[PDB]
Amino acid sequence: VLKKNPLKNKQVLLRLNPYAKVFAAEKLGSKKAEKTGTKPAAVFTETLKHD
Amino acid sequence: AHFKEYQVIGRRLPTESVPEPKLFRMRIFASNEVIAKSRYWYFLQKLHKVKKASGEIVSINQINEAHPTKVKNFGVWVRYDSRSGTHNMYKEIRDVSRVAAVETLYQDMAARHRARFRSIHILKVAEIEKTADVKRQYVKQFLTKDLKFPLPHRVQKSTKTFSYKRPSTFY
Amino acid sequence: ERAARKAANKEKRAIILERNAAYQKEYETAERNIIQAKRDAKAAGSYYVEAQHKLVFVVRIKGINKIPPKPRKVLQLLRLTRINSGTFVKVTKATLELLKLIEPYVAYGYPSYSTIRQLVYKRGFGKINKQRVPLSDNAIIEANLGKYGILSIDDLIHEIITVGPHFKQANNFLWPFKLSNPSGGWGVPRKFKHFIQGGSFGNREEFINKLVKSMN
Amino acid sequence: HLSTYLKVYKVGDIVDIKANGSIQKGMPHKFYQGKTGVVYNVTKSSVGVIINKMVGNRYLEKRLNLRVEHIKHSKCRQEFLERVKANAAKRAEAKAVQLKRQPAQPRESRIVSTEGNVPQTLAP
Amino acid sequence: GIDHTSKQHKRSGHRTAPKSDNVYLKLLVKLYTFLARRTDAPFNKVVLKALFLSKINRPPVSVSRIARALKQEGAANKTVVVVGTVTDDARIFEFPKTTVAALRFTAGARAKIVKAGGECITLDQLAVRAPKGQNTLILRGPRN
RNA sequence: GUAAGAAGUCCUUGUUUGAACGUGGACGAAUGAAGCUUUUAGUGGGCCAUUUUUGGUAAGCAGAACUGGCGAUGCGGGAUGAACCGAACGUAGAGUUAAGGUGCCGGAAUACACGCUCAUCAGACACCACAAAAGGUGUUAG
RNA sequence: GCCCUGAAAAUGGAUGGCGCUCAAGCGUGUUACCUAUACUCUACCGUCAGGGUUAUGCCCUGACGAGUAGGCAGG
Secondary structure (H helix, E strand, O other): OOOOOOOOOHHHHHHOOOHHHHHHHHOOOOOOOOOOOOOOOHHHHHHHHOO | OOOEEEEEEEOOOOEOOEOOOOOEEEEEEEOOHHHHHHHHHHHHHHHOOOOOOOOOEOOOEEEOOOOOOOOEEEEEEEEEOOOOOOEEEEEEEEEOOHHHHHHHHHHHHHHHHOOOOOOOEEEEEEEOOOOOOOOOHHHHHHHOOOOOOOOOOOOOOOOOOOOOOOOOOOO | OHHHHHHHHHHHHHHHHHHHHHHHHHHHHHHHHHHHHHHHHHHHOOEEEOOOOOEEEEEEOOOOOOOOHHHHHHHHHOOOOOOOEEEEEEOOHHHHHHHHHHHHHEEEEOOOHHHHHHHHHHOOEEOOOOOOEEOOOHHHHHHHHHHHOOOOHHHHHHHHHOOOOOHHHHHHHEOOEEOOOOOOOOOOOOOOOEOOOOOOEEEOOOOHHHHHHHHO | OHHHOOOOOOOOOEEEEOOOOOOOOOOOOOOOOOEEEEOOOOOOOOEEEEEEEEEOOEEEEEEEEEOOOOEEEOOOOHHHHHHHHHHHHHHHHHHOOOOOOOOOOOOOOEEEOOOOOOOEEOOO | OOOOOOOOOOOOOOOOOOOOOOHHHHHHHHHHHHHHHHOOOHHHHHHHHHHOOOOOOOOOEEHHHHHHHHOOOOOOOOEEEEEEEEEOOOOOOOOOOOEEEEEEEOHHHHHHHHHHOOEEEOHHHHHHHOOOOOOEEEOOOOOO
């Protein structure tokens, strides 16, 4: 009789998409990335900056 | 809006007979990547035989100023296909960044010539390393030793409607 | 008998949760791998280009009066029957010609997973023979489009964004999205120029997310 | 052009009408020019051709006789038959797909290299 | 605005009820509405559609037409059905012993059928005999 | 103009050196969503606008070909206005906007920023649309 | 590029008026804001369609509502 909206009302959110529970547990949106240090090329920075 | 500098590269699409074509690069002043890419194709159609369907862009990137706090004297080449065949202009702008120079240039052209973004073409913005290569007098005005000057009329912004003071503009 | 009902529900629910976890893994590893490919090209001194977008979202911008017949018919075909109504479309040459025709009267672009999810959750309405039925439950989708293996609203979002074999059927099941006017406004003073000329219509390619998030 | 006479035309084949100026006999049909019709009967001297001509808003059926000099084999169904045979082959291979056609798709990701092709910057 | 495409507020026609005022006919359609709704048989929907028809579109059907229908192969013992009216025919001399159901029989036609041996029946009795229309043969009269 | 398939493809031999019919076996680009009669009102050389094109001269303009709108149509704006901009209407409420606007009349910044301009009746949409081709020891930037 | 002139009469007169001069004018850019019978949400009325049910009625669901000549229906 009345449309209730997910993105509010965690109950009707959880009626659908039950992955949301563990999603919020692991938090999965403030998730950190594996660090790397792949430096770029001299030709790349050169042709970016000029000529 | 507040402009940005964008590096753009175009590949015009490979064929059999011709793998790996020649990757033409350009520097654009524009608000965002959409306008930057449109301007890229607009200049590339003039220079060479390419098309947005006949070509592709490889790497859109941003260029930030290496020293955006160091004050600089830029010289700018400009041209605009009006009213005659195209004719050029050299202007000088004292500012910190190429972005600010281009912004105040567009505003100055709109003011002093009624010439518009659609009408204007940027050829080359270039920092002038050495003094005595500065040609224009309104920029030469500001390079003198131990420069000082006042602001003799101060008028104070008032938040209220009424004042009980008979205000003063001093300094 | 009620225990049998609950057992079937529990089975389908576990299926949904493993499917959704798989989809999350797919999306994150895909974007991470694209990023690392860009970085690898940069490190090797080569350039990496991303795949051209295959899905676009389109929004109507102009009313119904004094519309010429060809764009009127094309908007009928794309189910943009009124102002601010919107639809997803798969982009090929055949559709690009339509978009070229209806550029003055629509704003379109390349949407994000976040806005697709928000649209399908808040304004997601479905067609059950007719009628614009609100979704409200995964059963309504498992009935109609369980033929195509789409048992959940997230499976539907996946078939939409990852354009699948049955994108046509899922999108036609989806009623045209009814949207409001943006809360922050349109920005520009005058709408009916291109996005490039300080207008609003035409392709903007990423800011459609901002626009539809203001409008939804 | 003698190759316009060693041309078998069996009932069922589709042909375009393009009448050449070099033969005053049987120059047909002012606007039946570049129009296609299948052949219904053949005699000597002769081939039959039928065309769906529209009058008002219905397609009526006009049957006609023409000299062989004006008619020409149609390459209308070349890709159709090629695709049908290739579809049979692909269906056999499947039995061992998207055999349907598809429009031009968006080109996918790739990598562009800089080995001897450094990008050449320029301006107006 | 909406820029409609389908000429909103269509009526669909199709005669949901009869123009008549015969209470007995209204009992008949009240019965066949239940039957066509609950049975799933198509025969009952056909009969209900035919009951709404007018006199112009319910032509009479003759004894001779019925005998033609019964001369068909494997169709002699079927319960023939005419929703309209059934007339006599003095052109045929031999008539089967069939069962037939209809709204209205004429006196001569009823007499001929009874004389051959069969019976004349109403649609409600046809319903309590064969709800789904099992082993039935519907006939219609020439329209023009 | 035609074509984009199950009224289509591929094996099976009786009737003019072979064609047609017939026998039986194996299997298709995108998007979006019915047909048949029957019968009768009112209107059936009226007004406006755009762009295609023929002929045009003091200037205007006259003929045809689409399209859109008014006629029948209220609402917001343009100070006011049949055909300009937006947008088409059930009765109410809350929110967001369009076009147009935010010194006072008048709801909304006498907001921010860069320049230019002083007119002895400046200007406050222009249109190498008219006055029109220039003149001026007024000013600014090239 | 802006400014002056670049001819136009006759009741008193109009950037709409007041009036405005680093503007309340011209050009351009960045934000905020006002605001329609337009868009979104909800309720109610009516129509239409689809369903259900021992009653030209009862129930569920949804989409729609401009109107002259004129037509049909219910009162």
